[PDB]
Amino acid sequence: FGKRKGEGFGVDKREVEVLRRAEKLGLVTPGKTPEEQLKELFLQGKVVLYDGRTGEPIEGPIVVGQMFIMKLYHMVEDKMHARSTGPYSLITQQPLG
């Protein structure tokens, strides 16, 4: 928010609006300025987020952050097996691949 201050702009209708629902919630000390309220709200680990599809905010602060996440190895089974017809065992006549 410091850069936001200098870059030239303040707070949204949206940012204020989610604050309203946030104090009614109990995340921000009623009576303090939005600038101060947002700090409180940030320290809690959550910030305001807008939808992306509608541009409106998501009522209520939502946490966000840098979480490490790994990708897991795909086993041979992962190669989804689909079989129509095929071989058959010699003594047992049931399907075999």
């Binding site: 702009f9 303040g10 707070v11 949204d12 209708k13 599809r53 509608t54 541009g55 409106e56």
Partner: protein, 229 residues
């Protein structure tokens, strides 16, 4: 004009280079900054066209997973660095431009080392392509195209030379969009929307240009409501 129409969106602009461009527009009625900023954003990211490396041909290399002697980086690392390269051509006549570069020995290969082409410009000169040691022979041909969105190297499969290897297409010239709707006070009523949207661009096009294209795509779409049925 004097009263309601002179009281009109003062479109103000602030742009440095071809990458960043802020755009303020106020006053606006109730909840309109949002009404406008959001669609333009959605457009600015999905709809606008650009340039990205679509194919590469190292001369002695056959597959993408090879390593070139005297060359610290591996083929995959370099093809990766190329995706980072941002070019800019000036007119439609340039659909597919093949940039050429060949450097030898103890030199660092940067994007400025590509032989100049008439209507094309390289905004990413100092980008690092590779570090050549000694007896380091690197001679390649990197294709470049004008497209839109993301196109996996698998989807296009470019075929300039049989030993060439396609690269993933990174076409939106727009890096990121951002818009704020802060209150503004105009005389009588205080509730007022002030819409300012910040646009970032790889250089191919400019923030302003982008924005213009954007609003047009929207306009063009608002016309599609013509013939009932």
């Amino acid at each position: 004009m004097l009263d309601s129409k002179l009281k009109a969106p003062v479109f103000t602009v602030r742009t440095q280079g071809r990458e960043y461009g802020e755009f303020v527009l106020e006053p606006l009625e109730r909840g309109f900054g949002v009404t406008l900023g959001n669609p333009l954003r959605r457009i600015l990211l999905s709809s606008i066209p650009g340039t990205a490396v679509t194919s590469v041909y190292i001369e002695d290399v056959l597959h993408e997973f090879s390593t070139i002697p005297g060359v610290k980086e591996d083929v995959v690392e370099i093809i990766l660095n190329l995706k980072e390269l941002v070019v800019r051509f000036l007119n439609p006549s340039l659909q597919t431009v093949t940039l050429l570069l060949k450097a030898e020995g103890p030199k660092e290969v940067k994007a400025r080392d590509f032989l100049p082409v008439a209507d094309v410009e390289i905004m990413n000169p100092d980008l690092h392509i590779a570090t050549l040691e000694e007896g380091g022979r690197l001679n390649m041909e990197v294709r470049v195209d004008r497209g839109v969105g993301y196109v996996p190297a698998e989807k296009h499969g470019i075929k300039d030379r049989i030993n060439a290897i396609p690269v993933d297409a990174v076409f939106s010239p727009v890096r990121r969009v951002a818009f704020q709707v802060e209150d503004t006070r105009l005389g009588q009523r205080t509730d007022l929307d002030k819409l300012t949207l910040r646009i970032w661009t790889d250089g191919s096009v400019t923030p302003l240009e982008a924005l213009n294209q954007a609003v047009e795509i929207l306009r063009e779409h608002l016309t599609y409501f013509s013939n009932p049925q």
